[PDB]
Amino acid sequence: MEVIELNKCTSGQSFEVILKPPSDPSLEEIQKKLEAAEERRKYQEAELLKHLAE
Amino acid sequence: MREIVHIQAGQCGNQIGAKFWEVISDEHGIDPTGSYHGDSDLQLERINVYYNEATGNKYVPRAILVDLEPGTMDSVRSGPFGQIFRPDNFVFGQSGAGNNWAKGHYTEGAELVDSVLDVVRKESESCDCLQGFQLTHSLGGGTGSGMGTLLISKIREEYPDRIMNTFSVMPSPKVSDTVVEPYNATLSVHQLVENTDETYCIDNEALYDICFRTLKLTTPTYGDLNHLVSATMSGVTTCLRFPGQLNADLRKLAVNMVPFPRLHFFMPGFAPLTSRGSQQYRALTVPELTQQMFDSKNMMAACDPRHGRYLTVAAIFRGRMSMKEVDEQMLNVQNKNSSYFVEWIPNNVKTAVCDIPPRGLKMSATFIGNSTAIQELFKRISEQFTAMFRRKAFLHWYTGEGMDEMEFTEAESNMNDLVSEYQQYQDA
Amino acid sequence: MRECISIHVGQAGVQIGNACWELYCLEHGIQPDGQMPSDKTIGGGDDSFNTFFSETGAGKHVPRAVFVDLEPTVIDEVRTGTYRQLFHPEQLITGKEDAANNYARGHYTIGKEIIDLVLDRIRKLADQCTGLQGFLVFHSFGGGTGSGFTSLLMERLSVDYGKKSKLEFSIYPAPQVSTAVVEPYNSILTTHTTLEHSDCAFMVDNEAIYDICRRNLDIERPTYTNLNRLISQIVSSITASLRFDGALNVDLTEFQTNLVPYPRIHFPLATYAPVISAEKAYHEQLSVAEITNACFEPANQMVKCDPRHGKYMACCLLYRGDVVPKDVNAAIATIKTKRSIQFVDWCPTGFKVGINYQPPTVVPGGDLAKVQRAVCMLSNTTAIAEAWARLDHKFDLMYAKRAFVHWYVGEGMEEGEFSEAREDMAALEKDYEEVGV
Amino acid sequence: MYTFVVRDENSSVYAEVSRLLLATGQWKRLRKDNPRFNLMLGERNRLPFGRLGHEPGLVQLVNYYRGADKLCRKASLVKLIKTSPELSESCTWFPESYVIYPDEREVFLAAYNRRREGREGNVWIAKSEGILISSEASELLDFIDVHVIQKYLEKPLLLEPGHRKFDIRSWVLVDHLYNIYLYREGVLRTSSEPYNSANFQDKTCHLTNHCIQKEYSKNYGRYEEGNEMFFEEFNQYLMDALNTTLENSILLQIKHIIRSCLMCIEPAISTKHLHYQSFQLFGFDFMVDEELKVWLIEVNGAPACAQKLYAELCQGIVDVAISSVFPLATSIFIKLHH
């Protein structure tokens, strides 16, 4: 096992030991899907209010 | 999600509603004056859920009192907390409804409903974030039944995005001899299936049997029946009125309790069962609460839980006790009776503990179950309904208010469908 | 120095954030008034602690933090609590109506109406950053806000800060403390939408934390306060290298480089040792060998799973206290002959090691005993996929019957988002199995 | 009352185990997909180990060891032996074997010739019913197109009367504490047909599978019932014919091989400090050559018992592996001590 990359400072130290070597959507598209759900809600609500109006 | 608007309708709705306001007022340190004289500040943290504050540091129930008859509300006015209700929220007529759903829903109730909704609106508009409504009513009479479900459909049309919750008293021929109650109740269930989010089935058949067989009361009074009701209503609203994690508002309760929109009828349970002014000197152990609260003899709907399966369950434990022991007792009822909990809803039992116990008891527990066995209750109403309906008996009392036979046929069909949808899910 | 912005979403994220910042100030000598007597650059600077704190001319050190919940109960007791003076009112963001444990409600319904307010309050923080490197995002999987709003914000952060890195500290749901039956749904939903946007996520299973508290702190029924002060210790140990002088994991980019070779497999397992009850009368202080060996006991993991039946892609050991490299390498040599540590063939078998000489700080009056030395292992093992299988199984049982689905559809979500999410998860499960077996 | 679930309907051993559990009147069987169980008798493939030990209020036990397959599938047992120092390449009780893909191909060529080079026997067997023994290296690699190739025991111990080949099956139970229990009753699976040094593709008498002998061999059932000789009879045969005993001549070697196999993988599969617990029943298969030296041919992770012994072995599983963990209201095993 070889220690490598040893660094030291007053607060601690740091190193690496090797036991063995190797063997995004737009703002538009998000606004689109937020508003597509919003009007799915508003359709469903509207349908309820139509039924309640009957 | 803070404020609840409470509406109570009809004789049963006002009698059980008044006892509810009595019970929780004392739990929160409010006296008939409307003033606070309690010790714990746990009492006031969520007081706004059910009480409007006035300037004199007086607390006024967000409560609306409806009847097509003055009588009972006069009786509420002169009872113990009758002076705590703000006077303009008494909304009543003189007709009466004559135990007639059609009168409450279509004629007499029509005349009065708008003036009720004006009180609702005033109380609604002055909420910071209204979470929805709770209604108390019997399904067997005319006002609470017919006008109550009319009110629900109106409120739903003007507040379509709020939660609608009822405490619905189911008729039993053991304590009523009014022949048309199966009609009123079936017509009401049709409405409840469509326009409420969560309904507590408070079965007068269960209330009577508990009083007679368990509390050994040979002549149960309405006060005896309502003593069980008010304990239940205290227990099942505990998570809403005190600080906590689980089911702390109506919507979260609905999300936790209702896996299918129509299957929203809950079977409450309670332990220990007490009679009015009883002794009750031995506190229950946590294992006693847990076995008792799941016992069929403790349920407030006359249904056998072993005859169905639980979809969801909420358990609320009140008093000072070991959360560890509550956990292990809860885990043991599930692990020992696991067949009775549907496998396809994992972890469907949610448990809550509140430190403040109800008056009279150091230790108590309230059960709230979405069991497919509730179908037994709707079967019973259905059998009493069709026995008269197949001969079209007593229909003239309804057709003379303008109703048609087919509205009955639609109602009994929807309730029979409800029954069949419960049986569906009882067979995974 | 490069600034790091911490975002706390939902009850779980806010309360865990609370415990973290409390620990941070204790570790850095910042008082609850925000004053730091030992910071001798008054009014500013660019020391390593400045990565997490800004400064006012009055000398106040201010967390680079935004808190957001869709209801006010939780953040309000921040505003009125012990560290009320630490935070700027602009930093604490509340709705009035929460997501009711509904992913769709927090994502689509309530999320659409507060996402822009939150980004703006975040933008006020970035504007104050000379060289912002990215975000640490704290949230539950199970709550509606923690799952649904978090996935919304992460999509938008990727837009408005396309080059900044994004790290998660994620609370995986446990029935012993959970508040909703739909938590499996929420978990799969938010994992699916957030996956491409997260460079490195640290999952804590409340079940593991619960049991560590019961068995090693003798707490009969752990509360969120017990759970969170342990989580904050583990979080402290993972972020310590960003707030203290040192040379390993010095910026957020290095976490991906050191821990995540494949960008979808970005969920390192954390193991922590030792956990000792402060009320414990007699305690024998544990050695470098003993705490390093405990890093391979599943009972000390943040997720219970068996790393023996998977493969490793990376391993970091983070020591706090009286530790020198000689002890570490002997401990590792010994452990390697007594334990089953298999790496994937394309990675070297080896450990990155960071030591900080200061032992862990404990809260006064907490459950944790102050110890000589402690360690956090961050290992990217395919065994963590066991937790995906558990969750995915629970989702399937419910979804096959469409239970509760109507609550999400009712919010505008389409039922097909469920099966997309679940198919993404099924692919994740297969990636883990190819890498690991 | 304890609960269990049955997810391997095809298992003779645990089918019996389930019946015995219910007859106690303190065990209840739930349906396959109910997770509120104490005990899972699991499926043979892709058992969901990752889902066990996550149910609060339930101690959970399962009848397989996750990772025991590396002892129990042909090619992995060879790699396990060659690459583990505790077994070593230098292992005196495993037939020299090689992993061949349709890798140690040219690894194997050098060993073949060194023996033909050196005036030696060169019979070998290829294993995975797809069962091929030869002296031709041509003919094996002819047939390969994963498989294992290993020495054929050219000089087996042959019973008299009959000139009969055989192998020994030892049932071993390993509980949740990783105690290693050897069942006192073993069984001899005998060949019905006399053994031949020239008839290699005449596999009647070269493979002692109880399936092959029942009705692919003419003399079945002749010398003993089912071609199954028990340990009482086999020891008397060793006494009467060979002036030795089972314990001295064979069982010691079997105990040493068993303990050495399970000790080796123990760090990898032990459930000592795990959130769920394992036990498992293994069937160990040994050859015995003519100088009374024992060889390991393979390890079966899902064995069946011999009919006579089902009642007794399955009772020992219950007593030792199950009621160890879930107590109720002269031992049939010998404990191999480590």
Ligand SMILES: C=C(C)[C@@H]1NC(=O)[C@@H](NC)[C@@H](O)c2cc(Cl)c(O)c(c2)O[C@](C)(CC)[C@@H](C(=O)N2CC=C[C@H]2C(=O)N/C(C(=O)N/C(=C/C(=O)O)C(=O)O)=C(\C)CC)NC1=O
């Ligand atoms: C013979 C009568 C009058 C009637 N019986 C029937 O109708 C029977 N006919 C088959 C049957 O239906 C019946 C049997 C039995 Cl054992 C009942 O207890 C019964 C009905 O219950 C009621 C209707 C009350 C639940 C019960 C009833 O109304 N009671 C029982 C004792 C008093 C009254 C009563 O409860 N009056 C009250 C009341 O509150 N009474 C109280 C009495 C008390 O203080 O003990 C109280 O608790 O306040 C109200 C109308 C509400 C203000 N009805 C009957 O007993």
Ligand SMILES: Nc1nc2c(ncn2[C@@H]2O[C@H](COP(=O)(O)OP(=O)(O)OP(=O)(O)O)[C@@H](O)[C@H]2O)c(=O)[nH]1
């Ligand atoms: N460890 C830990 N887990 C928590 C904490 N608070 C909640 N959780 C867990 O997270 C899940 C619930 O999510 P919450 O954060 O409470 O929900 P939320 O983000 O506020 O979303 P809504 O309240 O539904 O709008 C459950 O698994 C809880 O057990 C906490 O403080 N610490």
Ligand SMILES: Nc1ncnc2c1ncn2[C@@H]1O[C@H](COP(=O)(O)OP(=O)(O)CP(=O)(O)O)[C@@H](O)[C@H]1O
């Ligand atoms: N190296 C070897 N030398 C001589 N004979 C051998 C041998 N390997 C196997 N045999 C014979 O072949 C038989 C079956 O071989 P094998 O080891 O494949 O058993 P098997 O697994 O294929 C059937 P099972 O697993 O049910 O026992 C052995 O029981 C033995 O009779």
Ligand SMILES: Nc1nc2c(ncn2[C@@H]2O[C@H](COP(=O)(O)OP(=O)(O)O)[C@@H](O)[C@H]2O)c(=O)[nH]1
């Ligand atoms: N449990 C209970 N049931 C009641 C009460 N009052 C009436 N009922 C029941 O309610 C039904 C009659 O309805 P009621 O409320 O009196 O009629 P309404 O005034 O027209 O709404 C019958 O089944 C009664 O048994 C009460 O105070 N408690």
Ligand SMILES: [Ca+2]
């Ligand atoms: Ca009129």
Ligand SMILES: [Ca+2]
């Ligand atoms: Ca400074």
Ligand SMILES: [Ca+2]
């Ligand atoms: Ca990115």
Ligand SMILES: [Cl-]
């Ligand atoms: Cl950028």
Ligand SMILES: [Mg+2]
């Ligand atoms: Mg008007």
Ligand SMILES: [Mg+2]
């Ligand atoms: Mg009446």
Ligand SMILES: [Mg+2]
């Ligand atoms: Mg919340």
